């Protein structure tokens, strides 16, 4: 079923949604998830060192925690972008 041969897996290993998505759309989503994660890490760094914004864990923001998990989503969408490009989308 999900066994494959050759240099690249087929599109169906991406699930039922990303197997139909273009490689350029998955590539641009990946940069968008990487930039949101890099912004969330950098802004949580400056919230840690701000002397009125770190006490009792006030440096933790929900949108920066949720934004930082674009990191593993940027990894996966750029892997998925490569697989759709090798499969001709």
């Amino acid at each position: 079923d999900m066994t494959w041969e050759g240099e690249y897996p087929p599109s169906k290993v991406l699930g039922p949604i990303m197997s139909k998505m273009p490689s350029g759309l998955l590539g641009l989503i990946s940069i968008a998830c990487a930039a949101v994660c890099a912004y969330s890490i950098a802004q949580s760094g400056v919230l840690q060192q701000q002397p009125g914004a770190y006490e009792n864990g006030s440096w933790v923001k929900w949108y920066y925690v949720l934004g930082s998990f674009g990191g593993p989503l940027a990894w996966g969408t750029h892997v998925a972008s490569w697989i759709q490009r090798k499969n001709g989308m």
Binding site: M2, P9, Q48, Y54, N56, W62
Partner: protein, 731 residues
């Protein structure tokens, strides 16, 4: 089958005493029994898993009952640094009058002094009275009644689960990550927020008042509004008297780091925020797999797709799903391998990051708990490779696993074994060579000629976590690093105070004596792995026995032909690795105890000089600390260490008795029993009596097992008698 064992017709018709012996030791090998189907096999394992769960909760109810009835828990919570915790009372008619007063020193009745640490753990989780410990022992006594009913119930014909229910991997992982792990961690966060952290704050919250007493003054509205910083507002002070309201905070979820300064133990608000974060991660992790609702991963599809396109792993992980789902021995071997790591991690982290109040000041309990869990972890690791070896004989299909990652281990098994042979020989040639070098130059009066390698790699890891004594100035021991700046706002002031305090166990100061013993531990790990890996990889066949899988996991030999084939079975490599396991855990717990007994004794420089050579271990650790133990009784009387001195010699005797079954083999003893059978048949008035099973010598595999069990029990009982009486006798 008639004539016990009922499950084995072959042993049922054995005429000798071998039938009763082999009927006992094969009673739980349910896959080998006569008439066993796969559906009946899982249902018997499920029901006997309910029986094992009931035995655990009966054992826990007994620990709670005997402490509540015969112990001094209420006197221990009043004065924790002066009271000795009572395990249970002694009723022994063989006791003399002076033994009765030797064991009832501070009490009325003779007692055993508990070294399990249940007093420090029950006090930390909120127990204060004997009535609360009793009600806990009743509830676990009724929980194990329910688990005994459920094992009976799930063997009734309408409640026996189908084989497809037992093979539902996706629904079991989803529930066991969520419900078993994550929900229980969320519920344990519910206990220590509601019960344990008020009890450390001087507030009693029990079943009578927990519905009407909120654990936080803000009371659950900052949770639902997302204002979660309210739960970390004011922690306990640095001058908080533990168990009282004086100096006490109200924060329930902090990230303080380090220890409570009085108990030298973890903050309960840190444990609550730990358990709550562990709860969320596991609840999320239980949303991965595809159950009845369409979303989720299929585990056969993940394994079939993970083949690297470079081809360095050949077919990838295809076939591994059906391999694991149909092999209970591969499932058990994976489970024992993680439990062995989890039990080693338990021992290594409980001494160093003390979780329970006043646990680090109980020196004998800390030595008992480390030695307990490291020996448990050794037994689990040997059993993981043993059931990995049973899998290759009994369950491995070479055609289903064709060119995947499992089959390719057998394909290069000579490269794996001969490189484990290299690393074992390299470690042993140079660790023993450096110890003998340091023995020889110290014996000749020149200790400055010692080869003392400084363990700078592990000292770098301490300095990377903030240890300042090695002056490396790298990550957390450097105030300019971004790891130090980002982190000083959170846990790091508590952590840097704890790691740079030289009177706890958090990253103990190490030197060249710690170098040589870690390379002895690495030697013992590598050789024990080598026997076990060669046991699993050669389980199906070698050049000496190419058809070895036809003979099974355990068999005596293949005879004296082809040079001789003693101990060729994969069972026999378990048997040889058990000696190497006990030696390895021996070298580990010897090192932990001597490094702690010199830190607790106030002379840590005695370990730093004498551990570089073997005579320092013999003279300054074994011979020196034996002195309170072997004077447990003497011609001038006895004290309460007399039970450990008896057990010390009791342990030496069982160990040596094991050597008899280990060195003498069968054909000597079968010939000796034949003359005993003659003497009974020719003796009048004993001729009235006859055996119904013919007396024979124990078989070849059986006395290997019997000699190993005597060797292991005498190993454990000798060191348990020594590690307890030396710490109790000194402190």
């Amino acid at each position: 089958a008639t004539k016990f064992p009922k499950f084995s017709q072959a042993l049922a018709q054995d005429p000798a005493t071998r039938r009763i012996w082999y009927g006992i030791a094969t009673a739980h090998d349910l896959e080998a029994h006569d008439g066993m189907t796969e559906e009946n096999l899982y249902q018997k394992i499920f029901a006997s898993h309910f029986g094992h769960l009931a035995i655990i909760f009966l054992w826990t109810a007994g620990n709670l009952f005997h402490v509540a009835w015969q112990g001094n828990f209420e006197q221990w919570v009043a004065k924790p640094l002066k009271t000795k915790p009572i395990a249970h009372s002694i009723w022994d008619p063989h006791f003399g009058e002076s033994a009765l007063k030797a064991f009832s020193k501070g009490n009325t009745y003779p007692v055993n002094i508990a070294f399990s640490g249940v007093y420090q753990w029950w006090y930390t989780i909120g127990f204060r009275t004997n009535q609360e410990l009793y009600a806990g022992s009743i509830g676990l006594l009724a929980l194990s009644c329910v688990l005994l009913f459920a094992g009976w119930l799930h063997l009734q014909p309408k409640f026996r689960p189908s084989l497809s229910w037992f093979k539902n991997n996706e629904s079991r992982l989803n529930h066991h990550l969520s419900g078993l792990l994550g929900v229980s961690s969320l519920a344990w966060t519910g206990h220590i927020v509601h019960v344990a952290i008020p009890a450390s704050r001087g507030v009693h919250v029990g079943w009578d008042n927990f519905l009407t007493t909120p654990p936080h003054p803000a009371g659950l509205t900052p949770f639902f509004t997302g204002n979660w910083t309210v739960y970390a507002e004011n922690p306990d002070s640095a001058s908080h008297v533990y168990g009282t309201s004086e100096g006490a905070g109200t924060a329930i979820l902090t990230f303080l780091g380090g220890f409570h300064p009085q108990t030298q133990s973890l903050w309960l608000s840190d444990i609550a925020h730990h358990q709550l974060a562990i709860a969320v991660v596991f609840i999320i992790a239980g949303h991965m797999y595809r159950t009845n609702f369409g979303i989720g991963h299929n585990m056969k599809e993940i394994l079939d797709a993970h083949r690297p396109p470079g081809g360095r792993l050949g077919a990838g992980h295809v076939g591994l799903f059906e391999t694991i789902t149909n092999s209970l021995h591969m499932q058990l071997g994976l489970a024992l391998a993680s439990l062995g790591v989890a039990t080693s991690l338990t021992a290594q982290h409980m001494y160093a990051l003390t979780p329970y109040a006043y646990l680090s000041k109980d020196f004998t309990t800390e030595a008992a708990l480390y030695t307990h869990h490291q020996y448990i972890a050794g037994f689990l690791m040997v059993g993981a490779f043993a059931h990995g070896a049973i899998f290759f004989v009994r369950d491995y299909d070479p055609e289903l696993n064709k060119n995947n990652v499992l089959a390719r281990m057998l394909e290069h098994k000579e490269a794996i074994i001969s490189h484990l042979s290299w690393a074992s020989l390299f470690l042993g040639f140079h660790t023993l060579g450096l110890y003998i070098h340091n023995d020889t130059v110290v014996a000749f009066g020149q200790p400055e000629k010692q080869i003392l390698f400084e363990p700078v790699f592990a000292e770098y890891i301490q300095a990377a976590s903030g240890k300042a004594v090695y002056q490396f100035n790298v990550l957390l021991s450097s105030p300019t690093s971004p790891a130090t700046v980002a982190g000083n706002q959170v846990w790091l002031p508590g952590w840097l105070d704890a790691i740079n305090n030289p009177k706890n166990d958090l990253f103990l100061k190490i030197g060249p004596g710690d170098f040589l013993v870690h390379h002895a531990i690495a030697l013992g790990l590598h050789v024990t792995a080598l026997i076990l890996v060669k046991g699993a990889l050669d389980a199906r066949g070698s050049k000496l026995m190419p058809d070895k899988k036809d003979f099974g996991y355990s068999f005596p030999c293949d005879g004296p032909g082809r040079g001789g084939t003693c101990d060729i079975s994969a069972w026999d490599a378990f048997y040889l690795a058990m000696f190497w396991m006990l030696n390895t855990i021996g070298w580990v717990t010897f090192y932990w105890h001597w490094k702690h007994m010199t830190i607790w004794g106030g002379n840590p420089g005695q370990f730093d000089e004498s551990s570089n050579y073997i005579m320092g271990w013999l003279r300054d650790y074994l011979w020196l600390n034996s002195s309170p133990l072997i004077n447990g009784y003497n011609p001038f009387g006895m004290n309460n260490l007399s039970v450990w001195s008896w057990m010390f010699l009791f342990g030496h005797l069982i160990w040596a008795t094991g050597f008899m079954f280990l060195i003498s083999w069968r054909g000597y003893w079968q010939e000796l029993i034949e003359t005993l059978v003659w003497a009974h048949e020719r003796t009048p008035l004993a001729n009235l009596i006859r055996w119904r099973d013919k007396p024979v010598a124990l078989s070849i595999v059986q006395a290997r097992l019997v000699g190993l069990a005597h060797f292991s029990v005498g190993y454990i009982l000798t060191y348990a008698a020594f590690v307890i009486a030396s710490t109790s006798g000194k402190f």
